[PDB]
């Protein structure tokens, strides 16, 4: 292989990124979109936020235009994300009791429906549990709902689409800590009792020199419940500015990560949370960290490209 698509093809291992359609009419990113990657999910675009401003309204243009850059470039799709709790409309927030479940219900029906055929996982419900285990403290649905909302998305969301891989998804439960002993024990659960779930996802936004050594260990854990599992949105974030040992250690990195699910039969893939350093999330949120992803700001390859080739198996 000479690309990281190459790399996952040959591998037979789904490779993808999070795509804003907006930076599609930016060549040098469209470019590296088509040619190094296998598979695409929305970055924000499929969003509640994004997709159902106002109660019952939605807004399905900017989700359909990366549905389409899928269809068009022959990748496959990963939906992200029906319910979650972070950037959901006020209009929601002020419903309650049945009227906020309801919402929800629409919400995950609606959007299905409207991608059914074209998306082939969802990220049903995102980032549910706690640091340190249990449920998050902070989230309208567990608030207004409790416990049994997980289940009410999943089986909703199986109702409007009969074959689409149902996953969960969560950040910080790469290794095994009480957060990924609880989504652990649901997984469980759910299987045990029927409920839908197929994959589960393990966000991995990760900070240079951390990579939990027993990420592997956790990986099959999970498949061996008997779901998919799928590194979901990998970037290995460190301070500013980037140097020579910082790239070399990122780059080892994102080796383990995408060594961990190669090694992981039910490992589906690796999708990175963006393309371009330019635009990545992380320097927003956390002041002075970034050059987390796998080109820096001026579309040139990190030495973490040539590991993740490696780690594929190029
Ligand atoms: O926070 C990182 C990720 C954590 N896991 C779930 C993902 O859904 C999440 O992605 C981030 O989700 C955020 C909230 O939806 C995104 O923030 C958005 O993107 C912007 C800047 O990146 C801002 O303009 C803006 O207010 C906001 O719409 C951001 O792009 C996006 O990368």
Redesign the pocket.
Known sequence: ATTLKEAADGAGRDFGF?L?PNRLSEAQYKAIADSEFNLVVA??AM?W?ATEPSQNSFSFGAGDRVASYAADTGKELYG??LV?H??LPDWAKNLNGSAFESAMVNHVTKVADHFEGKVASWDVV??AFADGGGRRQDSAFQQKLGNGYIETAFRAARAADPTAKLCI?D?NVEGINAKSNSLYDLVKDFKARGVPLDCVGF?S?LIVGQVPGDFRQNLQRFADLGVDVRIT?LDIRMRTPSDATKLATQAADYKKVVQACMQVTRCQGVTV??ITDK???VP??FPGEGAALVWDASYAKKPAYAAVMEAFGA
């Open positions: 999070a804003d970055e924000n969003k936020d992200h994300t979650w972070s950037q995102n980032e998804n950040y966000q936004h949105e949370w963006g635009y990545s999330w927003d949120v």
